[PDB]
Amino acid sequence: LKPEDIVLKEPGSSEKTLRTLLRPSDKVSNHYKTTSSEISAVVCYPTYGVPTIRSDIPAPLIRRVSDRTSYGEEGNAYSLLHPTIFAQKGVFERDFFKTRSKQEISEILCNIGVKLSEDEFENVWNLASKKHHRGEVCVENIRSVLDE
Amino acid sequence: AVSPQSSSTPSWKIETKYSTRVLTGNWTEERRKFIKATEKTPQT
Amino acid sequence: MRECISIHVGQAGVQIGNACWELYCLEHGIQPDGQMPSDDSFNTFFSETGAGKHVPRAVFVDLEPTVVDEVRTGTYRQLFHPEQLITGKEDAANNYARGHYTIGKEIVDLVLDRIRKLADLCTGLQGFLIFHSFGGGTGSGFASLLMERLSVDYGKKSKLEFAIYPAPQVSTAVVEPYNSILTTHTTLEHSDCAFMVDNEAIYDICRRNLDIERPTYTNLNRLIGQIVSSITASLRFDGALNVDLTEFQTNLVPYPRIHFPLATYAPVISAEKAYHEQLSVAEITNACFEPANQMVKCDPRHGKYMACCMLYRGDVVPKDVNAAIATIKTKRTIQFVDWCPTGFKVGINYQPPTVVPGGDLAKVQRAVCMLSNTTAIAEAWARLDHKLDLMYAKRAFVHWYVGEGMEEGEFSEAREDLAALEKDYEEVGVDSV
Amino acid sequence: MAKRFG
Amino acid sequence: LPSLRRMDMDSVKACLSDEHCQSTTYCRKDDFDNAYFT
Amino acid sequence: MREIVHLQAGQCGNQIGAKFWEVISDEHGIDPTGTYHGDSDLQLERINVYYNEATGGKYVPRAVLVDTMDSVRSGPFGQIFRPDNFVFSVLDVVRKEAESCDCLQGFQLTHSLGGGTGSGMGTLLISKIREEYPDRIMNTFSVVPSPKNATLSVHQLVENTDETYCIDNEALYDICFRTLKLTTPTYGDLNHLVSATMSGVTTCLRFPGQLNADLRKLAVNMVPFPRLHFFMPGFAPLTSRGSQQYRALTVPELTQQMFDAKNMMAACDPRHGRYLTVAAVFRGRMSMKEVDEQMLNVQNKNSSYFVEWIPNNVKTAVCDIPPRGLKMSATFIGNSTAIQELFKRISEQFTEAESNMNDLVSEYQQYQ
Amino acid sequence: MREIVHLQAGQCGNQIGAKFWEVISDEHGIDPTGTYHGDSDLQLERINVYYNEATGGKYVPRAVLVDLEPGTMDSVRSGPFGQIFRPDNFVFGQSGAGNNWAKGHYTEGAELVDSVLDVVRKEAESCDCLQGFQLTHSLGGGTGSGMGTLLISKIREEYPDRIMNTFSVVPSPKVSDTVVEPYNATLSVHQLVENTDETYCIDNEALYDICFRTLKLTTPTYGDLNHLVSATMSGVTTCLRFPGQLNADLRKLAVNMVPFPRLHFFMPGFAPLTSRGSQQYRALTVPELTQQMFDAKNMMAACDPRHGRYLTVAAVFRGRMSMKEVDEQMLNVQNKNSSYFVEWIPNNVKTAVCDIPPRGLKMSATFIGNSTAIQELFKRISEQFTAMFRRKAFLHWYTGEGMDEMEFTEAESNMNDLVSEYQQYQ
Ligand SMILES: Nc1nc2c(ncn2[C@@H]2O[C@H](COP(=O)(O)OP(=O)(O)OP(=O)(O)O)[C@@H](O)[C@H]2O)c(=O)[nH]1
Ligand SMILES: Nc1nc2c(ncn2[C@@H]2O[C@H](COP(=O)(O)OP(=O)(O)O)[C@@H](O)[C@H]2O)c(=O)[nH]1
């Protein structure tokens, strides 16, 4: 039977209950909303424009004389005022982030003078492939696994 | 001469009582209840 | 600890306040119920309480209730304080008299008291931001009485106005040219500087730049909120050359009756248009000097720039700012007065502007907000004073005014004050010898 | 307009 | 480590030096011990 | 905050007010036995403007009816009223209703100008309640006789009301014959139309919008001199049954059916006259650019028929709730110096009322 | 640790003590059945101050309820906290006083007082050491004004060294519901002065005033006023029950407030009262309590302190607070307006700081003020009494109960001496 199931509602804000009210054929919910509902942004989009550093276009190899756009390959004044040994004799950030074959890395590491063993070289190569998303290792990555 | 109050604060004047949803007087306060803030007893 | 107090009086004040505080809660992460899910830059506009709730530093005051009950019943009911949503009991009726002598007198004490309680909790408060109109009764009467009742209390603190100036060709009411002159007569002696922005000019901006047909007030209020957030970007977010609220007075107004600068927002563009063109620093500031991108309908080709001030915001470095301002200066089309050879002010922030979900604007990387003090504003005052000269010539609409605390002599003295301003604005335009 | 006879 | 503006925010509220960021921090002594550079 | 006391006077004023209460109880959603039925929260927000409640939520209107009376109670919403307001001591009940109010905004009057009840009893009622309460606005909806009794009421009406409208029932017949295509226009349909246009000026009182304007804002915005308050109502979106879906419900069509002449509610051609001022209060979802553009384009091109010495003749108000069924609607009120064309016809058909009408006509004449 | 015996005389006293025991059981964690359901171990050590110990781990309040009719005791036995009280502590008469002070003091309020004395000796002897007694009554009635003063006039002669404290509901100027009210108001201050150590004057008009301008209650009841004065009552014995940095019982305040044995009339107040909408939004700091705890609108007595001058001022604070900013603020308030404090005494303000706020509140403070502005309260009761006494109106109800005419003049003389003595500090 159950003459009342869920129909007991509070009319205003008090604690006493009233039955549920009916409405045939005059509902105006769709047409009685307000302008103030438009301001309802409550706490995805692409960002539009050029960056000043402009690091998303590919780097040039032979730099033109008429080119003004930066790419981030030009260092700050910390680099051009106090260069490192790498900077002061020619090698830069690019050649430390260039993928090398295991033959190239093996000759690299032998020519430096650390004389790794075969299993130790395999462990170093596995860790260096482990830190990359795909496995393209670089000499910076080799130094990073060699530091510890 | 006192700190000025709102135009809808309860006074001794006989106003007409309305429902809680029609915005006539002191409805902003009447729609809410008194609520406890903390239920944790502080230590010494 | 850089605090700002925002007072929005009038219906034009409170709709703009709704848009502005929506953008403000969007900039930080303030939820509509007052919570901070990420638990420093927010305290400028958000006082923190002891229960983890952030109440805003806003005072909403209006004489008719309705538009404030919309705030009390809308989506932001639990953000705003119930006590700083000050409401009147009945309307000001587009009348200076009712907003300045009869009805504003009974309720100036509550808003003054609440402003004092707001400023007592602050430590490094910078100043006030007044949001009001010129064609209203409570937007022009109560605001003009608020300014002179706030100058006596606080004094040496910045009082900056964001005003809805009357439109050149279009209008809303009839008696607006009365109670715009009559409130700009009282404003001049108690306002530090007053930014004013039109409404029909924003209509033309939305039609011509965002390709949007039939804009509602939400679009104009959102662009105004973007300006207002960009003008207080220095206090919240650290940049390279921070420009706090005190710098606006010493850099814009040279003479205390010439404190009316313009306002403009340059990268007004849609998502479809922004993908099809690059937004460099060398062209975004060039859009600011276009007469058609100004948000007040006035023509600067017969108006001499006198004090300029951009607030850059986003991925900007100072070098192309120099390289763009330099090539802006050399062009003969824009004319500066001889005695202001510097004529420029640069501020840089490190935080790019945010985008509103469901809004009209596009998320970009760099934006500016240029506040121009020009001699071309005197063209608007001339055509606005001509309306008072025509209507008062045979005593139209005066009977509604003098019967509510006004006097017949207040028309002539404000008329002669605006005549004094309309002779003052040309001595800054002559060429010196 | 719309006049009166129109 | 706490920013100065945060220090003023915490001074505005009446925190009794046990909720203040002046005298309390979340890092333990081991965080201070291993906070060298070489 | 802003309450309205409604006064029905005369014979036709009772019908006009009763079917005004038809409309007002209709779009507020009020059951004829008194109770409210519940969908939204915007209906029961500002019912203190026109209703005060009894116990149990039964809303009775703030109306007192004075003259027929038995035919009102036999109508659809005839039981909405309190029986003690059947006054047929009017001063006593209206002052009790004003005393129970919070802060009164004005009075609404419905009556006629062509009989011994609206002109005789009602104008004395206005003269009494204006003297008792001089700081309010007297809204009087007046049915005028056709230009193609009245003199004895207008000469005392001019000193009191400061806010009045002429109805001109032949113009309502012109509506229902020309622009509606209704073969059998009942009196009920005519004063249903005038109730719809009379509830169209009190919309900002009861519903939020984007540009609110009460009756006092209209009173200051269309009265330039304290005697010229004779207005000329209208109601635009009225189309035939055979032209229902042939309409693009837009701002342009609403503007054209504003400023046309047959839609207006006076038997006067506005070309001899000039519009001193215009108020077009809009209801619904209008983009304000479109209202903004078409509230001055009419001024820019039709400039030979707008008055000089006012830089802006129009007044715009926008609500957010349209009437039933329709989505965009708006109401016209306007001051024109074509009103005197009616009074020149009335004056041709004791001495002080004739002299006052002549002076009023000459006052309307010199501004044109 | 020192226990307090609570006595409830009259209908108003019974209702006000019902709400006082409800707030006490709320803040001590006692259910209506009498057991213990609180979480802290710090709510149970000092429960002997107000509650006795029964079998089964249940507690009974140390309260005595007194009335001349059983009308309100049946209503207090069926309330939300009715069954917690003891049945033997219900002593009631058969015939009501009928708002007559004379028969409530001499004829029919004098044979019932032996049973009340027996029950007070019964429970005041079971305790180890007793501090004193609290009395809750109304001066404008006949039960709590006659019997409520006969109880005072019989307790002092048995326990002279104990503290006698009263929370008297004095008549209000405007909202007065009794015609014979000034007579019983006058005849009670006659023996309310030389027979008690502390008296707090709480007015119903001032409580309605607090409920209107502060709590913003448009339809207040007597329950809300009772809750306000119950929160005040709980705030003056907090250092007895809870530990703190600087504790102060009622003997502390009796020493620290009254300068002379006849000047013991105070005015209470409660600091953290805020509206419903602005309850979550108000920062609870010590300056916020200090600013409005000294406010004129936060007065439970209907006399403005700006008319008078403050002799001594108390301040009992609750919560985890810093006591540099109570000394700083309570010297700041003394130095800002120095014309509102008597200058022949160096300071005027006593500070007490407890550690535990009331449940649901972050911080709290209770105000007790000894002012010369309370002499306005006896300058209106006197004028009404001498206005009604000339025309011998409503006098035959008193003279038929064994009262002569001259006790009225002697009581008026003592009340004029009270008014004139408070005049000399102004
Ligand atoms: N840009 C912008 N302008 C607005 C907005 N709301 C109102 N206005 C302008 O405000 C003008 C009229 O405002 P007011 O007359 O001051 O309305 P009010 O603030 O209620 O003042 P009163 O009418 O006297 O009570 C109109 O001409 C509009 O152009 C808004 O949200 N944005
Ligand atoms: N709403 C409505 N108006 C009516 C009705 N009958 C007549 N009218 C109007 O009332 C006017 C005449 O009323 P009038 O003669 O002055 O009534 P009287 O005052 O009793 O003499 C006519 O112009 C009609 O416009 C009706 O049934 N309903």
Ligand SMILES: Nc1nc2c(ncn2[C@@H]2O[C@H](COP(=O)(O)OP(=O)(O)O)[C@@H](O)[C@H]2O)c(=O)[nH]1
């Ligand atoms: N504040 C407050 N006052 C009360 C309450 N109940 C009664 N009173 C006051 O007590 C006065 C009458 O007290 P009365 O009934 O004569 O006490 P009696 O001596 O026991 O008869 C009235 O003026 C009331 O204002 C209450 O619950 N709270």
Ligand SMILES: [Mg+2]
């Ligand atoms: Mg308005």
